[PDB]
Each structure stands twice: as structure tokens, then as C-alpha cells.
């Protein structure tokens, strides 16, 4: 009765089915918008938030994104496409700190990395 994985021969276990907003939470792509980027940003729509500032709002997990090159902190001012990976300290989004990693490519096919430590360690230097 008390074990951490449950099984019974007489009954199934309860099968939870979830909604597409929750599933969109889980997916690497925008499954409400035909598998487009899990984040998209346009400069006129971002309150002078940089790429760093829009990377910071993204929830835990793994995701695709787009950023327009007139957005600040974009490499050499180019638009970028790539993937973003996010974790809270010990997996507690309701009190803890946030860690963010980006692997991405500009408009010329060139690969760059950018990384953010939690506890205000902040951004590690831009690497091409």
C-alpha cells in the first residue's frame, strides 16, 4: 500500500489526461501555433527588454525561441534562433533562484553560447 511505485493486478492505476495549454508548457515548440518557436520576440513589443531580460522570464524545461536583432544584447546586433534550457534551484519555482542556458545561431549560421547563474551570479561572458 505504501510503496513509491504502485501496481495492482485487480485495478489499473489512474490515467490523467491533460489540456493543450499544460502540454504547451511541456513541449519544446508552440503546439498552439503550428510548431513555431516556443518563444517569439519583436522589439516594438518588449518595453526595451534585452535578450537577457526576455530569456529570464522563460519557465523551467527546454524550449525553442526567436529574437529580433534590434533587441539589445543580441550578438553583433543580429536576429537569433536557437534553444533555451531553464532550471530553478532544487526545482522550487515559488521561492528559489533560476539558472538559464542558451545555445543559438545568428543570421549567418555562426554558433554562440550564453549562460546565467542564479543567486545573482548573472551572465557568463558571450562566447562565439
Amino acid at each position: 500500500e505504501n510503496d513509491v511505485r504502485k501496481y495492482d493486478e485487480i485495478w489499473s492505476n489512474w490515467q490523467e489526461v491533460i489540456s493543450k495549454d499544460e502540454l504547451k508548457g511541456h513541449s519544446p515548440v508552440d503546439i498552439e501555433y503550428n510548431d513555431y518557436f516556443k518563444y517569439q520576440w519583436w522589439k516594438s513589443e518588449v518595453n526595451e527588454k534585452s535578450l537577457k531580460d526576455l530569456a529570464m522570464t522563460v519557465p523551467q524545461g527546454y524550449h525553442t525561441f526567436y529574437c529580433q536583432g534590434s533587441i539589445a544584447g543580441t550578438p553583433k546586433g543580429r536576429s537569433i534562433r536557437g534553444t533555451i534550457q531553464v532550471d530553478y534551484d532544487k526545482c522550487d519555482p515559488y521561492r528559489a533562484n533560476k539558472f538559464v542556458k542558451l545555445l543559438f545561431t545568428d543570421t549567418e549560421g555562426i554558433p554562440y553560447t550564453l549562460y546565467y547563474g542564479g543567486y545573482n551570479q548573472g551572465w557568463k561572458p558571450l562566447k562565439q
Binding site: E9, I10, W11, S12, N13, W14, Q15, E16, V17, I18, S19, D21, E22
Partner: peptide, 22 residues
Amino acid sequence: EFNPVNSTSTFKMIRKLPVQEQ
């Protein structure tokens, strides 16, 4: 089939065997 009032989810279950001394 089950649908909690406080959840954006559904739940389903089946009995696989006739109910007995287990």
C-alpha cells in the same frame, strides 16, 4: 471516468479482474 472540479485534467480507471479475496 472522473473530472475534478479544481483541475484542468480528466482521469480514467479499469477493473482488470473479478473482485475477490486479495
